[PDB]
Amino acid sequence: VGDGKYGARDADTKIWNGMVGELVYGKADIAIAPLTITLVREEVIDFS
Amino acid sequence: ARIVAGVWWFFTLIIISSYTANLAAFLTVERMVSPIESAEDLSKQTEIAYGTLDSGSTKEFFRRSKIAVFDKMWTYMRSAEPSVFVRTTAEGVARVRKSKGKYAYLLESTMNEYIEQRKPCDTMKVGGNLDSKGYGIA
Amino acid sequence: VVTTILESPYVMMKKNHEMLEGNERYEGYCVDLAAEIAKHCGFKYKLTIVGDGKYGARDADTKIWNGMVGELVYGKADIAIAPLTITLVREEVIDFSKPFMSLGISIMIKKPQKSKPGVFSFLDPLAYEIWMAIVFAYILVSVVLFLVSRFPRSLSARIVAGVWWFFTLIIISSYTANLAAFLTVERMVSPIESAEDLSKQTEIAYGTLDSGSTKEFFRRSKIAVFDKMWTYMRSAEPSVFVRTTAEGVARVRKSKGKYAYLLESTMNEYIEQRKPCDTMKVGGNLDSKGYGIATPKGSSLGTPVNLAVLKLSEQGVLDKLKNKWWYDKGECGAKDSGSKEK
Amino acid sequence: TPKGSSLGTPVNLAVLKLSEQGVLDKLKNKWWYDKGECGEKTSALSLSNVAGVFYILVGGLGLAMLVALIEFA
Ligand SMILES: CC(C)S(=O)(=O)NC[C@H](C)c1ccc(-c2ccc([C@@H](C)CNS(=O)(=O)C(C)C)cc2)cc1
Ligand SMILES: C=C(C)[C@H]1CN[C@H](C(=O)O)[C@H]1CC(=O)O
Ligand SMILES: C=C(C)[C@H]1CN[C@H](C(=O)O)[C@H]1CC(=O)O
Numbered sequence: 001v002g003d004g005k006y007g008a009r010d011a012d013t014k015i016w017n018g019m020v021g022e023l024v025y026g027k028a029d030i031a032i033a034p035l036t037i038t039l040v041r042e043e044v045i046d047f048s
Numbered sequence: 049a050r051i052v053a054g055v056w057w058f059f060t061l062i063i064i065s066s067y068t069a070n071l072a073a074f075l076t077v078e079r080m081v082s083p084i085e086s087a088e089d090l091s092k093q094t095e096i097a098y099g100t101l102d103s104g105s106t107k108e109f110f111r112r113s114k115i116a117v118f119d120k121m122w123t124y125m126r127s128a129e130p131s132v133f134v135r136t137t138a139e140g141v142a143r144v145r146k147s148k149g150k151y152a153y154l155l156e157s158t159m160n161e162y163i164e165q166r167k168p169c170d171t172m173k174v175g176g177n178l179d180s181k182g183y184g185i186a
Numbered sequence: 187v188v189t190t191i192l193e194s195p196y197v198m199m200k201k202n203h204e205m206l207e208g209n210e211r212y213e214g215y216c217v218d219l220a221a222e223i224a225k226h227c228g229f230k231y232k233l234t235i236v237g238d239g240k241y242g243a244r245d246a247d248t249k250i251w252n253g254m255v256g257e258l259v260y261g262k263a264d265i266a267i268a269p270l271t272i273t274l275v276r277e278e279v280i281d282f283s284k285p286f287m288s289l290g291i292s293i294m295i296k297k298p299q300k301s302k303p304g305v306f307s308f309l310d311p312l313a314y315e316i317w318m319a320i321v322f323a324y325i326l327v328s329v330v331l332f333l334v335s336r337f338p339r340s341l342s343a344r345i346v347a348g349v350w351w352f353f354t355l356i357i358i359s360s361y362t363a364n365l366a367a368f369l370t371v372e373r374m375v376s377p378i379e380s381a382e383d384l385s386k387q388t389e390i391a392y393g394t395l396d397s398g399s400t401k402e403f404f405r406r407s408k409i410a411v412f413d414k415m416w417t418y419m420r421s422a423e424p425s426v427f428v429r430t431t432a433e434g435v436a437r438v439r440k441s442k443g444k445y446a447y448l449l450e451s452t453m454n455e456y457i458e459q460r461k462p463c464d465t466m467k468v469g470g471n472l473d474s475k476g477y478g479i480a481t482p483k484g485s486s487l488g489t490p491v492n493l494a495v496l497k498l499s500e501q502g503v504l505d506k507l508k509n510k511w512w513y514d515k516g517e518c519g520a521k522d523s524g525s526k527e528k
Numbered sequence: 529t530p531k532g533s534s535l536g537t538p539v540n541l542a543v544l545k546l547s548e549q550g551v552l553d554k555l556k557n558k559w560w561y562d563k564g565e566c567g568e569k570t571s572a573l574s575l576s577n578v579a580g581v582f583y584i585l586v587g588g589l590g591l592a593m594l595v596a597l598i599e600f601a
Contacts, residue, residue, distance in 0.1 A: 005103070006104075006105075008103065019186070020186065023186055030185070030186070031185065031186035032185055034156075034158065034183050035183055035184055035185075035186055036104075036105040036156070036181055036183065037181060037182055037183065037184045038105055038108070038181075041186070045186050046186070047184035047185070047186055048184050048185040048186075
C-alpha cells in the first residue's frame with residue numbers, strides 16, 4: 001500500500017486512505033492483511 | 049503440667065514443620081508476580097504510563113467507549129506529557145524495552161503473542177482481553 | 187417471524203409462563219439479543235420455537251434441511267436467532283451475520299476436589315494407620331519404660347530414649363518433607379491444558395451429542411488425533427453419544443468421573459458455574475468457531491442484522507449480556523477467583 | 529526377496545528412499561508412541577516406609593526388654 005495506512009475516514013476531507021482507500025476507490029482488487037474488522041469499515045466494504 | 053508442656057511441644061513442632069514446608073515450596077517453584085493484574089488496575093493506579101499507537105482501531109476503541117474504566121483510561125491518555133502515543137509497533141515494543149518497567153503498551157493480542165516469542169523475549173502479555181474482535185479479508 | 191430453539195441459558199421459560207403470552211413468556215440471552223436487533227432494525231417480531239427441535243442438518247437420504255436452517259430455507263421463518271455455529275455446509279445454503287460470540291470444542295469432566303481444604307488435611311502427610319501405629323508404638327515405649335525401672339549410668343533407658351527419639355525424628359522429618367511435597371505440588375501451575383492427552387489414555391471414555399456440529403467435526407476431520415477419537419466413538423458400545431446437553435452433564439455427574447463429555451465452550455462455561463458445581467472444563471479448545479444470526483439468502487434483513495450485530499459488539503452490549511446470563515447470576519462463583527485460590 | 533529376483537534392487541532402493549525422507553520414523557512414531565496408553569499431583573503418604581521405622585523402634589524396645597532382664601540379674 002502506497003501511503004502505508006490501513007483505513008480511516010478523515011472528517012475534513014471525507015476521503016478513505018490506506019488499503020481501505022485503495023479498495024473503495026478501485027486501485028486494488030482485494031485486501032489481505034491484519035485488518036481489524038470495524039463497523040465504519042463494514043459499511044463501505046465487505047469483510048469475510 | 050507436663051501434659052501442657054508436651055502438647056505445646058507437639059503443637060510448635062507441627063507449626064514449624066508447616067512453615068519449613070511452605071518456605072521450601074516458595075523457594076523451589078519461584079513464581080514471579082506481575083505488577084499489573086488487569087486493565088482496571090491500570091485505571092486505579094497513576095504511576096505507570098500506558099499507551100497505544102498514534103493511529104489505529106485500538107485508539108478508536110478507547111476514544112469512543114461508554115464504559116467507566118475505559119472512559120477513565122482514555123481521559124488519562126488524552127492529556128499527558130510527554131505524549132504516550134507511538135507511531136510504529138516496533139517503537140512501542142522498544143519503548144517497553146527501554147523502560148525499566150515504567151511503561152505499558154496496549155496492542156492487539158496477536159502482535160503481543162508474536163513479540164513474546166521473539167528475541168530478547170523480555171516482553172509479555174498480562175490480563176485478559178479488553179474486547180474481542182477479529183481480522184478479515186476485505 | 188423469528189425461529190429459535192429452547193437451550194439454556196439462550197432461551198428459557200419464566201417461573202410462571204402459564205399466565206404470560208407472546209414474546210413475554212420467553213427469557214434468556216437470545217431473547218435479549220433478539221429484542222436489541224429488532225430495536226435497531228425497527229421491526230415487529232413474534233418468537234416461535236421450532237417444531238422438530240433441531241438446530242440444522244442435511245439428511246443424506248432425502249436431501250432436505252431440518253431445524254432452524256430448515257425453517258429458514260423454505261420460507262417458514264423470516265430470521266433465526268439462536269446458538270447456531272457457523273459451518274461451511276450451513277453457509278453454503280444460508281447467509282450468516284458476523285459472529286456475535288466465539289466458542290470452541292472443550293472437554294467437561296468431574297471435579298477432583300470438594301472445593302476446600304480441611305482439618306483432616308493436617309493428617310494428610312501422615313496416613314491414619316500411621317497415626318494409630320505411632321500412638322500404639324508410643325504406649326509400647328511407655329510400658330517398656332515402666333518395666334525397666336524394676337522396684338547417669340544405664341543401658342536400657344538410654345537405648346529406649348535414643349530409639350524413641352530417633353523414631354520420632356525420622357517420623358517428623360517425613361512429615362515435614364511430605365508436607366513440602368504437598369505444597370510444592372500445589373504450587374505447580376503445570377501441566378495445564380495438554381493437547382490430545384485423552385487420545386492416548388484408555389481409562390476414561392469420552393462422548394459427544396447425537397446430532398450436532400461437534401460429531402460432524404469429528405466425522406470429516408482428517409487430522410490424526412480427532413480421527414482417532416472419532417474412530418473410538420464410532421465403534422464403542424454402549425453408545426457414548428447423548429441426546430441432549432443436559433443428559434450429557436447428568437451422565438458426567440453420575441459416572442464417578444470415568445466419563446468425559448465433549449461440548450461447546452459456551453455451554454461448558456455456563457454449566458461450570460451452576461450448583462452443585464460438579465463439573466469442570468479441562469484443556470484448551472480443539473478448534474475455534476463462532477455463533478451467528480442466520481437469515482435466508484437474498485433477504486432484506488441480512489445487511490441490517492449484520493450491521494446491527496457489529497454495532498452491538500462495538501458498544502459492548504454483547505459482553506454485558508453474556509456476563510449477565512453467565513457469571514452475574516452464577517451461584518458457584520469461583521472461576522477466576524478459584525484460579526487465584528489455586 | 530527370493531534370490532536373483534527382479535524385486536531385490538527396487539525394494540533396496542525403496543527402503544533407502546523411504547528412510548531418507550523420514551517415512552519410517554513417521555510410521556514408527558505412529559504405531560508405537562502416538563497410539564500408546566500411558567501418556568498431575570496425586571502425591572500421598574506412605575504407611576509402609578514409616579512402618580519400617582516402626583520395625584526399628586520395636587527392635588529397640590525388644591533389645592530394651594532383654595537389656596532390662598540382663599541388668600536385673
Ligand atoms: C467460520 C470461520 C471462518 S469463523 O468461525 O468465522 N472464524 C474462524 C476463526 C478461528 C475465528 C473464530 C472466532 C472468531 C470470533 C472472535 C470474536 C467474536 C465476537 C467477540 C465478535 N467479533 S466480531 O465479529 O469481529 C464483531 C466485530 C462483530 C466472534 C468470532 C474469529 C475468528
Ligand atoms: C499495528 C497497527 C497500527 C494496527 C494492527 N491492527 C490494528 C488495526 O488494524 O487498526 C492496529 C493496532 C492498534 O490499533 O493498536
Ligand atoms: C446445542 C446444540 C445441540 C447445537 C448448537 N450448535 C451446534 C450445532 O449447530 O451443531 C450444536 C452444539 C453441539 O453439537 O454440541
